[PDB]
């Protein structure tokens, strides 16, 4: 079938550059917001880069190049040589989809641990994450509590240390009278942050200038 029906193109915008070394690959979010997967072979006790995929921040441009044994593994991805190949997203042949998938899952992870709207309430510190749509939402109460809202998994870490996971609103409304108002608080905070996201994103679309995200709203008392 098609690649687009497997994983959507990666969204590297606004992301602070990181580098992770897994067993098989080395994934980097280059400072220019281009994702960069580089494959590794251990050979003569050294590590050599065998091929490099390099992916535009819109996930639609794939530059794949191979060295002439290959490259020694540098801290920063090896600059492209002569033998290169540019494909578009839905022209990328099946040979590469898994390698592009490493990068896509990496960026979908980084978008889940990267703040877009930080908002300080009287009772908690809210963080709407970057991975829209269906953004993660952390709520770090000054009280020591933590409420992590995902797409269907809501973990609640109490003061003691107990941590459960809420699924459906059947388990949400069933909570004791204490944590129920914690949930109400975090829900109102998430509504706030989501409305602000929509408003400021539309204003950004109008002005079309330097980015309007991330945003930080308030101070810890």
């Amino acid at each position: 079938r098609t690649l687009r029906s497997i994983t959507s193109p990666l969204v590297a915008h606004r992301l602070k550059p990181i580098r992770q070394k897994t067993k098989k690959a080395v994934v980097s979010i280059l400072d220019s917001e281009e994702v960069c997967v580089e494959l590794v072979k251990e050979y003569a006790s050294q590590e050599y880069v065998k091929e490099v995929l390099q992916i535009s921040s819109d996930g639609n441009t794939i530059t794949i190049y191979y060295p002439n044994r290959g490259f020694p593994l540098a801290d920063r991805p090896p600059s492209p040589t002569d033998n290169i190949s540019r494909y578009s997203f839905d022209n990328l042949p099946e040979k590469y989809w898994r390698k592009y998938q490493y990068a896509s899952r990496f960026v979908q992870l980084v978008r889940s641990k990267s703040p877009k709207i930080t908002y300080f309430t009287r009772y908690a510190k809210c963080i709407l994450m970057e991975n829209s749509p269906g953004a993660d939402f952390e709520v770090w109460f000054y009280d020591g509590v933590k409420i992590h809202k995902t797409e269907d998994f809501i973990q609640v870490i109490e003061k003691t240390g107990k941590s459960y996971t809420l699924k459906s609103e059947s388990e949400v409304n069933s909570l004791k009278e204490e944590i129920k108002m914690y949930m109400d608080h975090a829900n109102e905070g998430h509504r706030i942050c989501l409305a602000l996201e929509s408003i400021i994103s539309e204003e950004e679309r109008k002005t079309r200038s330097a980015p309007f995200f991330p945003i930080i709203i308030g101070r810890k008392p």
Partner: protein, 318 residues
């Protein structure tokens, strides 16, 4: 919509018969003729079921055929076959067409038919490019560059802009002399800049102009200054400083890192310059990027000027 005369058609035979040596890396050197390559490639592409519409000469070769000594350097001999390329097997097979045509060049050649094509690649293919995006769609195979220059074979299905400046937008459609074999037929030439007359005037008078600045790759500044070094000059001062500021803008855009700038400068100097001229070229760069700089772009250009000055100090130190 212009036709060549005996004037340039003489140099056409002179170029398409020039004996080219391609040196190996173990492997022996190959001694080939351009017309032999074009014909043996067209033959094997037609036996694979792929339409060879146009066959064209491009690059510095077509620039030096149209005018004797315009002072550009017979460095690039480019061959363009407009070729349909929908599937990936098309590219994967054009590679094989090129290499199978490449085998037939030794007496003990088929005596070594136990040489894999990937093994054949090691000595006889230098640069190897493959683009297949939403707009562009083509493949390039270059040949070794030792004693002679680099012989490029570029099979195109759809490329958007394929000229640097006015002076190098000239293509010689080879279907005429290719059907052939005052003993000459109608050999059409064409400019990628549009109205051919104005661009050919630009070439023969050594000028610089392009009404398509939106679409230049970041490294167009480098050939702008390659032209300034070999003594070309603009046409309208109305747009020259604006144009330099556009070119510098897209340079900083397509090469943001210090080390990518440095890589491209080093790999440009070593590719285009044979026989200290590097210093004059670097000074033309310094002047262009120093004058043509918006005051806002402060340290963006400061790192680049320090870098070019360091390149120049290195050059004069060796």
């Amino acid at each position: 919509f212009s036709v060549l005369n005996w004037d340039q058609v003489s140099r056409l035979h002179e170029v398409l018969t020039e004996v080219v040596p391609i040196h190996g890396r173990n492997f022996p050197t190959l001694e080939i003729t351009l017309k032999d390559i074009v014909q043996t490639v067209r033959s094997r592409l037609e036996e694979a079921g792929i339409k060879v519409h146009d066959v064209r000469l491009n690059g510095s070769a077509a620039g030096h055929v149209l005018v004797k000594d315009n002072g550009l350097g017979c460095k690039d001999l480019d061959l363009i076959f407009h070729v349909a390329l929908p599937t990936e097997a098309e590219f994967q097979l054009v590679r094989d067409v090129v290499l199978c045509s490449l085998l037939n060049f030794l007496p003990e050649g088929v005596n070594k038919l136990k040489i894999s094509p990937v093994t054949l690649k090691e000595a006889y293919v230098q640069k190897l490019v493959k683009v297949c995006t939403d707009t562009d769609r083509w493949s390039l195979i270059s040949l070794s560059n030792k004693n002679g220059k680099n012989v490029q074979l570029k099979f195109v299905d759809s490329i958007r802009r394929q000229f640097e400046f006015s002076v190098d937008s000239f293509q010689i459609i080879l279907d005429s002399l290719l059907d052939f074999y005052h003993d000459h037929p109608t050999v059409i030439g064409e400019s990628m800049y549009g109205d051919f007359e104005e661009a050919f005037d630009h070439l023969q008078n050594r000028l610089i102009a392009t009404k398509n600045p939106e679409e230049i790759r970041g490294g167009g500044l480098l050939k702008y200054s390659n032209l300034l070094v070999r003594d070309f000059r603009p046409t309208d001062q109305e747009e020259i400083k604006t144009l330099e500021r556009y070119m510098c803008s897209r340079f900083f855009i397509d090469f943001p890192d210090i080390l990518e700038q440095q890589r491209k400068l080093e790999t440009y100097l070593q590719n285009h310059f044979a026989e200290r001229s590097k210093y004059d070229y670097l000074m033309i760069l310094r002047r262009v990027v120093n004058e043509s700089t918006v005051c806002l772009m402060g340290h963006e250009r400061r790192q680049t000027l320090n870098l070019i000055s360091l390149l120049a100090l290195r050059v004069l130190a060796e």
